[PDB]
DIS3-like exonuclease 2
Amino acid sequence: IFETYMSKEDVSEGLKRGTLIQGVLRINPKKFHEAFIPSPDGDRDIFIDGVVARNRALNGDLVVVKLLPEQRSAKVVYILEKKHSRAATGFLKLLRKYALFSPSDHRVPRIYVPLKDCPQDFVARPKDYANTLFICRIVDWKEDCNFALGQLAKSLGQAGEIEPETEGILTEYGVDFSDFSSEVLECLPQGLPWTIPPEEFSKRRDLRKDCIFTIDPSTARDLDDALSCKPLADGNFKVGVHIADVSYFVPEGSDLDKVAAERATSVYLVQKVVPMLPRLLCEELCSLNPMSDKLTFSVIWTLTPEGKILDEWFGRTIIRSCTKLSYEHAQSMIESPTEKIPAKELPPISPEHSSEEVHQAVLNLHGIAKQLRQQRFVDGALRLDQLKLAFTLDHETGLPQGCHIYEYRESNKLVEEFMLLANMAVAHKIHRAFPEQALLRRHPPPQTRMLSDLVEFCDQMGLPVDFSSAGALNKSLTQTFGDDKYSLARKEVLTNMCSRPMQMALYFCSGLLQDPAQFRHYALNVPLYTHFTSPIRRFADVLVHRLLAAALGYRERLDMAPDTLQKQADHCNDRRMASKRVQELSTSLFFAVLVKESGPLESEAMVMGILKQAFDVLVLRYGVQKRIYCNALALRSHHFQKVGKKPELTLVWEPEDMEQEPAQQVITIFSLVEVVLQAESTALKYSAILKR
RNA sequence: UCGGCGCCUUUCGAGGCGCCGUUUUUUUUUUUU
């Protein structure tokens, strides 16, 4: 039996007086008996122990708590906002009136389902339904039942496959993967051979004779932006960034606008993509495909060879892109400055231009982008880059064949510098035009509480890093380690440790925050930032397109209050967090399937934590973090000692032959060991075990 | 996250309830998909 909720008037009175504390619940995944909310006063979190103490609140709910008398313990007494999807994936068992549902997630409780929802052959023959995934939605949880009451949605398929588990994590996280109704496709233009209307040749600047190109990955269906560079007659360059004009095709108030607003970010998975607009807009009219006339919104600068701004112009234009490069052709043209590249390895080009113009254009943009990068990192930019893996999937069956490591070459930096310049320029324009309403991004500084713990950790172990600032933090991590096999692994382990206390970046509206100190982006060390570029994938990028066209005098001022923009910003934030979690879980699923169907995988590892009877490794080749126990090891003994706050584990192994003396192994932090990954009898679980 | 012990339900694939002994949760920024 749980405890009943309280009235709304008492909640409001105690929340305005200050006796009750609101906050977002966070639930430990590894152990499900404890939860934490952030304190408003100080840094350290408020403890909520047990399952009874938190009244029917799931992970992510925005709850209202009351502190227990005598780090600080509280109990949930009200729920303002229900932010959890109230859905789960799991298995059904015949415990009569009900049937039991056990979710895979251990934070979701156990669910009673009536036998009308259960299938027709479950009551007598339930043995074939012990490996079959079901989706169940909680509709009611009583105050006297330890089990929620649920409605069974459907049958996914066999557990351990690719598509049942994919649809399970999409439904559990709230991603709407359904189809578009006919009232949404009726707002699209109805002319299949679409052409530019002749009244749009006077309000826009015509750039159909320039050399404009796109650099995007080989597996790309939507192209948002294009670049151009031109050498001037006094040793300067005219650099232009061109973005697809999406807000011309999405009118305000139409059903397309509400549907696009409902799912803010597109979701990218390993095998497919859940879009935000219909296929017609995303892959035909809006996308900047080669040799077609497109309506764009563009920014043009005049830059010195070191990359300093002398002129600036915003405005609506009409372009025609000439080629579509990749991140691999651009790297070839970067790495071959004095030698002509043969036409066999190049994508097709419009006959108006030559490949020499594209070649010298990407060379000049590389020359400017190098100096912009160096100056930005002298000024104090911070960059904690971890390890990401990419898969090769078989075409017919859809199973993974092998994983490799995604490498950040120079062509990924060429684009990243010009996009960072266009975003900061547009942020300055729409902030000085409309101070009351503007959409901007902010990153708070990291938490002082566990930055002090990382400082006292690196005070030991002979590491001279410093965490006083952001540029100091980046220059210290780059200079101390250097380049070596043991050193690069040291860098990876410290990047994983340093990436832990950083906070998360937020969208916000400028009419609610009072001081300009909080408008600052911490990691990039700039005072204003906004996402003007790439609109097809995000909806805040279309809100910024409307604001900038109102500021330039092309239309009337926006009629939205400063609170409506804040509500839309909160929706875009939660959609971007759920999308990020979904992509991480999809990569983890495909790796577990690869380990099971590719035998044992042999690699090296670096210890990053040591406990009394177990230790955590980080597999260097794959980047996954697994825990190793001594019980699965054929060893005579192991001893744990603490020497100068530097733990030590000594393993005395068992000799295969009695005559040969038993070897010894000493394990401390930053030690290189060898591990093997082996699948086990459960469908999607594996383990890592030490070798020799 | 477990280690040990006791009990119950199994189609042997394992689950669930207690008693001790452990250990208080944060994985972020950038660009293109």
Q: What stands out?
A: The radius of gyration of chain A is 29 Å. Chain A has 13 helices and 32 strands. The first helix of chain A runs from residue 8 to 17.
